[PDB]
Amino acid sequence: GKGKPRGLNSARKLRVHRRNNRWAENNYKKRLLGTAFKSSPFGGSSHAKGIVLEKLGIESKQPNSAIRKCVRVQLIKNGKKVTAFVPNDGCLNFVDENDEVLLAGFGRKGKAKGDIPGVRFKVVKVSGVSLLALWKEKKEKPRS
Amino acid sequence: EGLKRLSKSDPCVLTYMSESGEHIVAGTGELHLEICLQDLEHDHAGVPLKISPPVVAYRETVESESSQTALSKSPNKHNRIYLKAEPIDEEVSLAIENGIINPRDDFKARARIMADDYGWDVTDARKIWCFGPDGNGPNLVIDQTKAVQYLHEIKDSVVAAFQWATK
Amino acid sequence: PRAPRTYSKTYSTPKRPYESSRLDAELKLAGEFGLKNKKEIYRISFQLSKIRRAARDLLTRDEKDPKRLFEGNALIRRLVRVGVLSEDKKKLDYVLALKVEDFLERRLQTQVYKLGLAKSVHHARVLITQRHIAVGKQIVNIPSFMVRLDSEKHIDFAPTSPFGGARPGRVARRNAARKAEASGE
Amino acid sequence: AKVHGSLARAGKVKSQTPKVEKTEKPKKPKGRAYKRLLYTRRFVNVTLVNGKRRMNPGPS
RNA sequence: CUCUUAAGGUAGCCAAAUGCCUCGUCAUCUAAUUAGUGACGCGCAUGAAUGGAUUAACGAGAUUCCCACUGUCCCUAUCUA
RNA sequence: AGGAUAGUGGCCUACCAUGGUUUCAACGGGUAACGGGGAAUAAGGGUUCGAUUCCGGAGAGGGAGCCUGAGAAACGGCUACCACAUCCAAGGAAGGCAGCAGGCGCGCAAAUUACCCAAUCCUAAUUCAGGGAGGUAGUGACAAUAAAUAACGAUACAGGGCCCAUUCGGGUCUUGUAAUUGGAAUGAGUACAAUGUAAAUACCUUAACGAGGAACAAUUGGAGGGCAAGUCUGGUGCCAGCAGCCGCGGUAAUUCCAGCUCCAAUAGCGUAUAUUAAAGUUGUUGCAGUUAAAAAGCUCGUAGUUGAACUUUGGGCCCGGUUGGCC
RNA sequence: GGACUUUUACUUUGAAAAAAUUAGAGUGUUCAAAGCAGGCGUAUUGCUCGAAUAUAUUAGCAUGGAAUAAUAGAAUAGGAC
RNA sequence: GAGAAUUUGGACAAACUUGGUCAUUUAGAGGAACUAAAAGUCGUAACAAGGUUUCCGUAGGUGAACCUGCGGAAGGAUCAU
RNA sequence: CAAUUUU
DSSP: OOSSOOOTTOOHHHHHHHTTTTTTSTTTHHHHSOGGGTSSTTTSSSOOBEEEEEEOOOOOOTTOOSOOOOEEEEETTTOOBOOOOOOSSSOTTTSOSSOOEEEEEOSSSSOOOSSOTTOOEEEEEESSOOTHHHHTTOSOOOOO | OHHHHHSSSSTTOEEEEETTTEEEEEOSSSSHHHHHHHHHHTTTOOOOOOOOOOOOOOOOOOOSOOOOOOOOOOOSTTOOOOOOOOOOOHHHHHTTSSTTSOSSSOHHHHHHGGGTSSSOOSOSSSSOSOOOSTTTSSOOOOOOSOOOSSOGGGGTTTTTTTSTTTO | OOOOOOOOOOOOOOSSOOOHHHHHHHHHHHHHTTOSOHHHHHHHHHHHHHHHHHHHHHTTSOTTSSHHHHTHHHHHHHHHHTTOSOTTOOSSSGGGTOOTTTTTTTSHHHHHHHTSOSSSSSHHHHHHHSSOOBSSSSBOOOSOOOOOSSSTTTOOOOSSSSSSOSSOOTTTTHHHHHHHTTSOO | OOSOOOTTSSSHHHHTOOOOOOOOOOOOOOTTHHHHHHHHHHHTSOOOOTTSOOSSOOOO
């Protein structure tokens, strides 16, 4: 037909041919080479807790504005260095200094979304206080 | 975690982060810190430590009213804004780092409460927007300049330009 | 260790998630019957879509086999037996033709309005779960029941539990003392 | 970049919004009674069709 | 652009057998190294057949380190001609 | 040929010979690789898992050797070495929780120093003993299944099924509206007796007390598109913030923060990561190769794959076999 | 029992493919997930049906067909009864 | 005859030392890249024939894109004597 | 034939 030989006794020249041309997939190499935890600072899983060394603040690119106020966190298990991001109407005062703090990824297989450069993660709770319950403050602040 | 339960290992020891960015432990005496700090190397963390004298609050203050008011040299193509300052007193400083007048406030409130018993006039909220750092720090401006040439920008770029170089 | 318990979930949501002419055909269907949520109109359409998934593979089979003969005239016996498919459709292809309101007419809450007896379909939910009407003699507080052709010649109220008698109902125990020493003594 | 977030600049539109107290309405139904209630709102007493149909006619 | 009296250190290289300031500064080697090494270079005063940069073999060439070996030392004793 | 085994054999030794596998992928390396029955996904063909309710293999800190015994290279048996390691009078002894509990450390991550042989089996010298095997509980929004959060009216108002007329609207009912009310009904509860059980809790029953919105109180998202739903209003004005994507915000934002209203799923609801369908964006069934990524510069060539055709048809006769038909 | 039929691929049937889970008959766990039970006689010391069935690849194991895809003996006749 | 210590010789060899080889992680003064944000400073090679037609190999120079020599090709600015 | 920029 077009290459790809239609011999009846010809399985191996189509079976070596498949998983030779399987390496071109954008995610198949990150499956079996194990690359998901030789970088990308978890063990190929959801979350980990870090430590607030200090914070910082980035201004976005064009066309965008309104500095986005991220935080500087070193992570617990590999000593790797990636920052976080704090999405609320404030609560940067709520995440105080030198706390343990739980992380989460932005959804797009890493790959910082459209306008926050140099970021990889967001925060789901800070020393187990569930800042969703403190931004929309349906909680007190337990001790931190 | 190790000093999170050395905090509760002894019913007087207070263990906290000093606001100059360093951890501070307090003993009742002078060998208490040695029997404790050997029991941080032992049983708790296992890692060598530095045991330093602490550092303190070095906050300085402009002197009387700063009579000498000479020129500054900025230039980038055109620019000229410069300045000379004077203190505000200790009773109004204590009256601003408590939460009695701080921004979010009404301008007639902070303008006439400025003239209740503070020595100042009633004309200091059409002479500033609000203040900082933190909306707390004892650092105020007064708009004693002339008629403005449509420069709304110097009420956000100057509060943004105001912690620096003040911090 | 003792045995694994075997259990399955019984509903599967549609795959285009939400649009107007799908949701409006829900709300007029599931609202005039007036049912709880989409957990049950999915779960009858679940097993509806699975028995047709069963049926049209023995329909792929020919007759004179075992399976299109043996169980083929057994579920079409059973669809007669559950009261859903009427006594004129023993033809092995009309089971593929039936659809909703026919797995709904033979539940409790719809069928009990059809004998009068309930004044509404939403009184007919209060008619069921508040320890009221039996079927032959055993009592039933479950609306999605699948009446099997033989209780509807015996469906009445409970032996106890008024509008059904045998005890005059016991908010009138609260309205005994508020009837006795409130209308005199 | 290096620190210019300037936490005086923070959630300021949380700070300067005027928050009134939330109101108090009668209790809406639930269960099947709320799905009873929205049944009649579509094809029984459809209020203002303004050409063909509109569900919530914001006043204009 | 610019001035001496013509053109102003290019590729390379280094405290090197050329660098007083000098025991320059950094990392390694050892308990300790002004000696080594590998980097830095606005080099008092490096540099292109007054040849620059490398380089296998070789050297009674200069130099530092390591393994084995020993009266070089601790700490000397003894014997023979 | 001999040894040794419980028993064949390079399983080990003496002698002799030079072989054995391999582009149908040997050998080496990786495995976050115990194998299988099996899961999740679902037009067909699949893809990714499977440490774990069963089967079988291995291990009892790490290796090694061991006597007893039918059966151990046992580890709730032993000896030695390493690495841990616990006591003490310093002289010496003492071990192996990856059995059940409970702790530590790690981590994003996971219960109770609970009771009982009463069930189901096993064990012995054996109908009686025993078993953290196992079972009953406790914690338990891992996953699942059934379905509370209310009827049903009256009144009054407004509309039209509806027979009428200039009804100044009279009638039937209808559908919504209202805190103006009504007399009904019941478990969510609580809790006698009973049942259950090794025992007791809890359900299945069931006394007697127990419902009018606030109390016997449903939330999690969302409202420019994809994507169902607010051109409603206030605050902010490239700030604060949002937004998976596209974009919003620069003095009324239909995307921001709130108040109302609405849409969604609903006792569950979003988020985060790895997955399968969607993806005919991996393709045998089923891709593309002039210009979008791609056809070797061209020609030999062993593989391997694929390879012109023809080698006994046509019958006739008999026999019974099934199914749909027969005035 | 002698005897030896070129050698396979394919395909029909049967056997096998532990069992639970996936299907699937039956069966009012009050319904369902589920279980595999039950159902009725006199209640004067009892009658009885069940606990189905199917898939379970490939490798073998026997079992018919000879189209399809290959295969071999009579060129020097050391051919054949 | 039983028989404890002791004891010769063989095998099993735990453990240990020295040499390699391979894999896995990891510290390291400094060097040489690459990416991103647009605010820039020198120019304007590319898009028109971009004003010297343009592109591919290759050799040489060149602050910088670049330029130039050769053999090609039209993806051109000619489907034509 | 001289010819290069233009937020």
